[PDB]
Amino acid sequence: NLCPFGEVFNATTFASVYAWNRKRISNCVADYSVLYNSTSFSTFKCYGVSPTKLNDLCFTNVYADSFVITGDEVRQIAPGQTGKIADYNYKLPDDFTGCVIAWNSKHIDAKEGGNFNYLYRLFRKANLKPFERDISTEIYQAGSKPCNGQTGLNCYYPLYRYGFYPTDGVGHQPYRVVVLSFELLNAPATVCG
Amino acid sequence: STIEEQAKTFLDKFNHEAEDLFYQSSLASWNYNTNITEENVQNMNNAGDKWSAFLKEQSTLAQMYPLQEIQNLTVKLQLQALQQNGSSVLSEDKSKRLNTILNTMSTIYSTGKVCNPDNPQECLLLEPGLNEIMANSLDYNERLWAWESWRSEVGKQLRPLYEEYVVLKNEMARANHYEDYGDYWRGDYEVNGVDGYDYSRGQLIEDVEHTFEEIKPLYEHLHAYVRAKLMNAYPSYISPIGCLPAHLLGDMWGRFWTNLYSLTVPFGQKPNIDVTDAMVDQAWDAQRIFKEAEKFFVSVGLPNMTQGFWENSMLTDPGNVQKAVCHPTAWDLGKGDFRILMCTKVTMDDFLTAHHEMGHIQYDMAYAAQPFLLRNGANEGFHEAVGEIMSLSAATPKHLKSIGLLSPDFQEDNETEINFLLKQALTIVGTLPFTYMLEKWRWMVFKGEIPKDQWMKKWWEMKREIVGVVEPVPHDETYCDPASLFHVSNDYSFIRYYTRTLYQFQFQEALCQAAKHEGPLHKCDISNSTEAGQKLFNMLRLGKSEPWTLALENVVGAKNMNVRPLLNYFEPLFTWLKDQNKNSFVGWSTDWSPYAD
Ligand SMILES: *[C@@H]1O[C@H](CO)[C@@H](O[C@@H]2O[C@H](CO)[C@@H](O[C@@H]3O[C@H](CO)[C@@H](O)[C@H](O)[C@@H]3O)[C@H](O)[C@H]2NC(C)=O)[C@H](O)[C@H]1NC(C)=O
Ligand SMILES: *[C@@H]1O[C@H](CO)[C@@H](O[C@@H]2O[C@H](CO)[C@@H](O[C@@H]3O[C@H](CO)[C@@H](O)[C@H](O)[C@@H]3O)[C@H](O)[C@H]2NC(C)=O)[C@H](O)[C@H]1NC(C)=O
Ligand SMILES: *[C@@H]1O[C@H](CO)[C@@H](O[C@@H]2O[C@H](CO)[C@@H](O[C@@H]3O[C@H](CO)[C@@H](O)[C@H](O)[C@@H]3O)[C@H](O)[C@H]2NC(C)=O)[C@H](O)[C@H]1NC(C)=O
Numbered sequence A: 001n002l003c004p005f006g007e008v009f010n011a012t013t014f015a016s017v018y019a020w021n022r023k024r025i026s027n028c029v030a031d032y033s034v035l036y037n038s039t040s041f042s043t044f045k046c047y048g049v050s051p052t053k054l055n056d057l058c059f060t061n062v063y064a065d066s067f068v069i070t071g072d073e074v075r076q077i078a079p080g081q082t083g084k085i086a087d088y089n090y091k092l093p094d095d096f097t098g099c100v101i102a103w104n105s106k107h108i109d110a111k112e113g114g115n116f117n118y119l120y121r122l123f124r125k126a127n128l129k130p131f132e133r134d135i136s137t138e139i140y141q142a143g144s145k146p147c148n149g150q151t152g153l154n155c156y157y158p159l160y161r162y163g164f165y166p167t168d169g170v171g172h173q174p175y176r177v178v179v180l181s182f183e184l185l186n187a188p189a190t191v192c193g
Numbered sequence B: 001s002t003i004e005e006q007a008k009t010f011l012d013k014f015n016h017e018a019e020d021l022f023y024q025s026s027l028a029s030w031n032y033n034t035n036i037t038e039e040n041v042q043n044m045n046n047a048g049d050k051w052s053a054f055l056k057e058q059s060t061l062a063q064m065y066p067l068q069e070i071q072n073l074t075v076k077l078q079l080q081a082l083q084q085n086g087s088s089v090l091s092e093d094k095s096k097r098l099n100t101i102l103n104t105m106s107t108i109y110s111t112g113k114v115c116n117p118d119n120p121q122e123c124l125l126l127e128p129g130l131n132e133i134m135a136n137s138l139d140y141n142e143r144l145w146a147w148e149s150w151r152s153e154v155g156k157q158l159r160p161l162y163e164e165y166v167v168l169k170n171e172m173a174r175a176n177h178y179e180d181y182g183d184y185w186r187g188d189y190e191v192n193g194v195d196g197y198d199y200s201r202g203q204l205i206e207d208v209e210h211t212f213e214e215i216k217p218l219y220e221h222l223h224a225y226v227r228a229k230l231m232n233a234y235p236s237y238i239s240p241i242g243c244l245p246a247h248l249l250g251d252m253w254g255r256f257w258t259n260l261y262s263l264t265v266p267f268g269q270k271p272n273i274d275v276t277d278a279m280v281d282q283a284w285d286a287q288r289i290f291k292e293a294e295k296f297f298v299s300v301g302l303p304n305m306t307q308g309f310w311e312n313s314m315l316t317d318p319g320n321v322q323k324a325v326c327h328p329t330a331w332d333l334g335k336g337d338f339r340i341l342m343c344t345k346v347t348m349d350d351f352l353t354a355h356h357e358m359g360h361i362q363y364d365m366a367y368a369a370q371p372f373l374l375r376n377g378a379n380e381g382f383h384e385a386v387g388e389i390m391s392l393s394a395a396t397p398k399h400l401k402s403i404g405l406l407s408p409d410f411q412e413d414n415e416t417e418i419n420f421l422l423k424q425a426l427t428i429v430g431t432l433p434f435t436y437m438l439e440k441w442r443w444m445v446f447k448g449e450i451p452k453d454q455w456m457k458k459w460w461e462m463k464r465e466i467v468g469v470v471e472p473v474p475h476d477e478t479y480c481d482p483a484s485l486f487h488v489s490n491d492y493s494f495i496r497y498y499t500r501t502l503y504q505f506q507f508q509e510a511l512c513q514a515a516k517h518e519g520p521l522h523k524c525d526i527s528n529s530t531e532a533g534q535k536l537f538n539m540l541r542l543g544k545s546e547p548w549t550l551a552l553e554n555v556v557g558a559k560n561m562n563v564r565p566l567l568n569y570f571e572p573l574f575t576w577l578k579d580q581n582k583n584s585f586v587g588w589s590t591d592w593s594p595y596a597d
């Protein structure tokens, strides 16, 4: 009765994919039938529980991951199908108990001048184990010669920036993603529908 | 730590950096071409210079990766495109001088005006004035004035500019490790690395000449037929055994004999198929016309047009307030942005060309998941060939009947069929000797085999022998008629048109065989054939990742270009011409001329 719990879902702005955000949710009345008649979610599929039983269930702990990615890369937010986002930015555990949510923002995140406020990692040393972050700006140097100083011939700055214009194709328009995960513990907290 | 992994990361950085820069340049150039202002042209040039500078930086970088040590054919290709020194191998001042004369030639061609000596107040530029004369005038003297005025005015200016253009371009390509500018151009067809599908740069000459030899007889009979029919139109001006006067061919140069249909119609009693009257009468929405092309492409298993296309494309003439470039173009701006720029009128010619440009867009939509440097046709001929198979299918009377612009009279005499095939030949085979000779002359000039003092001598000697066309007035080396064509004076290769004409009928035969068509090939409409659609999409998706020979084999089963599709398409007209010319002269006289002494 204290948490709409969507200060996350609809708000002014979100965070980059490589620096995705976590939030705790507690003491809530989770009604998700009105959100079924909300702006259509590009994709809403659950893995551990039933979408037709959501509110009946009274789970203990709930967490919310919110971040922004491209349109073609969105279908990588799933167990397996490792790719650019699914390794270097945000991987999910193979055993997953939760739900994933995404919708399309036509001109909210996109402006006529263009939006260059969202970043993403392209070069990293190793694939990220589930639920890991690495925000370090370490100049990647795969070739043995470690420049380490600045931009180099075989060196690269590992962080790239999205370009989001209002005339883009659907494959790379700004998709906004929220992930719900219920950790499995023998300890209770206050959540139910 | 391998070079291949290093090269992969370099290519990743280039693709992601270049996608956005190319998109900005494309948006700016679109805003110019759809809205001619000084602000827009300056923004376009700014974005274009930024793109060229980024490309040259990446070129000098990619040259630091030793190509020979690359074992990945796909990556080797992307690196090769980037390592091309291109114009940069020229000195700075010499390159500036080359760009200056290039822009000057383009300007004088697109701006040259000729004035009537009897009335110096009437003056026409090439489009639409001079083209209107060359298309519709039936007066020999007026046409001869138009022909000679265009050449003797603008081409004389182009002559010295063209000499400097030739010499600098041959040197550059040589510095870029080629023999001449034609060899650079021939490099587009070169394949080096795939065992069993490679194809050399002289084989193109071998293949083009071997195939033009097989085209030769069909063209000879059409030439004889058109020559007799023109004798009825210009009495006492044409010899029954001589070449055709260059100024009576339907346009300024003879690239197309389209406007000779009225003078060569086999059976004028049959109604010549024009759907323009039906279009104006039927409820017409220019939107619906382009939508009908879209409905056609989905019916064969291809996707709709994008919402971005329908919102950003320019589908109508913007009017007097907003001046735009009306040359039909299909824009692939990148980042999934696809548009069509066309000042569409409600006409039959524009209907087929709308299909053609949307065919381009489907090609452009395809292979989108390929890396940047692979977003291109298999070779320079694949895109236009695809557009043309689209336009043929739309032009068949069965399709025209099924769409409802033709009443279901379903009249198809053996004379209605020959009429349609004859009009096709005026266009399709009339352009082949022109294309082959222009590129042959250009290749030889680039090779330095035609002395400077015999440019026009050899030009018109070659003119006579191959195309069977003779100049109406003599031209010394003061004149410069080759530079009087747009593609020549604007630094565009021309052999794409020969190659695309052959490719398109190979594709048409293959896709109609896939659609299990049985009648004559020219009556084939591949509409409603998801099998043919898939076979074409299976080829469209490669882009420039696979060699064009391998891509061509995947669909038609042959590693090389073939003439039997064209000859089988035109076989009925061929026999009809052979019958019609029994008491007519077949062949050409390398010696008859209109003028004497
Ligand atoms: C996030 O999104 C929007 C804010 O832009 C809110 O969506 C909606 O809020 C309105 C009220 O402000 C709801 O209208 C209501 O409809 C119900 C019946 O459905 C009616 O009983 C109420 O009296 C009111 O008229 C609308 O339904 C609602 N939609 C959804 C899907 O919630 C939402 O409040 C914002 N919340 C968060 C946490 O981001
Ligand atoms: C030359 O290098 C390219 C890389 O740029 C090689 O292409 C790549 O082939 C691999 C193996 O099939 C692809 O990896 C796969 O990706 C899918 C993505 O869903 C993943 O599920 C698989 O587990 C696997 O990791 C890779 O995506 C692909 N890359 C591209 C850009 O096409 C190519 O094979 C090399 N040439 C030769 C002859 O080996
Ligand atoms: C195009 O179609 C027309 C008919 O629609 C075809 O024409 C016909 O040709 C035959 C010969 O093959 C003619 O037969 C002959 O009749 C004469 C007397 O007129 C007789 O002396 C001969 O012994 C022979 O029996 C027929 O009359 C003629 N019909 C018409 C209406 O002209 C024509 O052959 C077709 N062309 C092609 C290339 O298929």
Ligand SMILES: *[C@@H]1O[C@H](CO)[C@@H](O[C@@H]2O[C@H](CO)[C@@H](O)[C@H](O)[C@H]2NC(C)=O)[C@H](O)[C@H]1NC(C)=O
Pocket: B034, B035, B037, B039, B040, B322
């Ligand atoms: C052609 O370019 C001009 C700018 O050079 C565009 O500008 C118009 O002018 C102001 C500029 O802010 C706009 O507020 C107007 O609404 C525009 N006038 C119109 C649309 O008539 C102009 O939009 C461009 N034209 C097109 C078709 O893009």
Ligand SMILES: *[C@@H]1O[C@H](CO)[C@@H](O[C@@H]2O[C@H](CO)[C@@H](O)[C@H](O)[C@H]2NC(C)=O)[C@H](O)[C@H]1NC(C)=O
Pocket: B299, B402, B527, B528
């Ligand atoms: C090829 O596709 C066209 C698509 O328009 C088919 O046209 C439809 O045909 C059916 C059956 O004759 C009619 O009921 C519809 O009204 C038509 N829709 C139109 C005209 O838009 C056509 O029949 C197909 N031909 C085939 C299957 O060979």
